[PDB]
């Protein structure tokens, strides 16, 4: 009975699923209200990733690949904070490519005119070596 099914695999909203809100902060689902809203708590030590406990609409949230394992339904802020520091949600979020893209975005928007000029100069300096390497690669093969 060889069954070869290749189908889509969505991320699921569940108790312990970590959401990323529009402001850049993180939350964890502690109880599901309906198919459009959840109850969430962001008890992170970092002020940027912190989110007050409350109702989160699922339209304004993004499903991160971080799920806190074995989190009880309706656990209060102390229990969610204990699970957060136990699982190390912050470190996994820093390893997540979404936060790397966000950090790159902040580094790009925090530039002054002198910074942009220096970026252009160092990018040309790097581009010289990349162009030489590409020319060598095309010449060899």
């Amino acid at each position: 009975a060889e069954i070869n099914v290749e189908a889509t695999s969505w991320r699921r909203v569940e108790v312990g699923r970590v959401l990323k809100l529009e402001n850049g902060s993180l939350a964890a689902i502690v109880e599901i209200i309906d198919h459009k809203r959840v109850l969430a708590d962001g008890p992170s030590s970092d002020p940027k990733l912190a989110t007050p406990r409350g109702i989160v609409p699922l339209s304004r949230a993004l499903l991160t690949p971080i799920v806190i394992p074995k989190l009880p339904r309706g656990a209060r802020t102390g229990a969610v904070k204990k699970a957060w520091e136990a699982y190390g949600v912050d470190a996994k979020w820093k390893e997540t490519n979404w936060a790397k893209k966000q950090l790159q975005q902040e580094r790009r928007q925090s530039l002054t005119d002198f910074d942009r000029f220096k970026v252009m100069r160092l990018k040309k300096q790097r581009r010289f070596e990349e162009r030489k390497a590409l020319a060598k690669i095309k010449a060899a093969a």
């Binding site: 889509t8 969505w10 991320r11 699921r12 909203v13 569940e14 108790v15 109880e31 599901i32 209200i33 309906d34 198919h35 109850l39 406990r53 409350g54 109702i55 699922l58 339209s59 993004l62 499903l63 309706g74």
Partner: protein, 174 residues
């Protein structure tokens, strides 16, 4: 019907020589503000007792805030609404975090499903279901199930309405 707040409105008949201490009547009224709350108090009191606004007074208006706005709760609302035929009962249930949010969801749902306005709906009882065995509507019973986890297929990405043209066809899988 708007950002609603629940008020206790306590009123009474004006004291006379026959009754130096008239009876006090307290009601729990959902209204956008205190003027509407007092108007609804006088309306419901005219519907039950020999008191009107010109012969009575408002002893107190207080705001009843939710004890636990951070706890997900099931609410059962028993209501009467007036249609072309007459007055009919409805029992409905809402999974919300406060009585006021349940009442706004109630008003939106009755407006959407039965074309009933604010002027034609009487909120008779709003109760909390202490146990999940008291839940009767299947659309709440599917939400109070054990280990409820579901995906969200076909999520249209939120793209800014001021950005007219995009160079990539968007995906609906995140």
């Amino acid at each position: 019907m708007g950002r609603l707040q629940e008020y206790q409105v306590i009123g009474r008949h004006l004291p006379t020589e026959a009754n130096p201490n008239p009876a006090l009547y307290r009601m729990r009224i959902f209204a956008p503000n205190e003027v509407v709350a007092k108007s609804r108090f006088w309306y419901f009191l005219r519907g039950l007792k020999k008191v009107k606004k010109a012969t009575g007074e408002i002893v107190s208006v207080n705001v009843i805030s939710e004890k636990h706005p951070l706890k997900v709760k099931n609410f059962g609302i028993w209501l009467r609404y007036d249609s072309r035929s007459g007055t009919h009962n409805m029992y409905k249930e809402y999974r919300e975090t406060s009585r006021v949010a349940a009442v706004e969801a109630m008003y939106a749902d009755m407006a959407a499903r039965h074309r009933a306005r604010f002027r034609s709906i009487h909120i008779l009882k709003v109760v909390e279901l202490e146990k999940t065995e008291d839940v009767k509507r299947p659309y709440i019973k599917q939400l109070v199930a054990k280990n409820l986890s579901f995906p969200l297929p076909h999520r249209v990405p939120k793209i800014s309405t001021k950005k007219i043209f995009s160079a990539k066809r968007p995906s609906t899988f995140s």
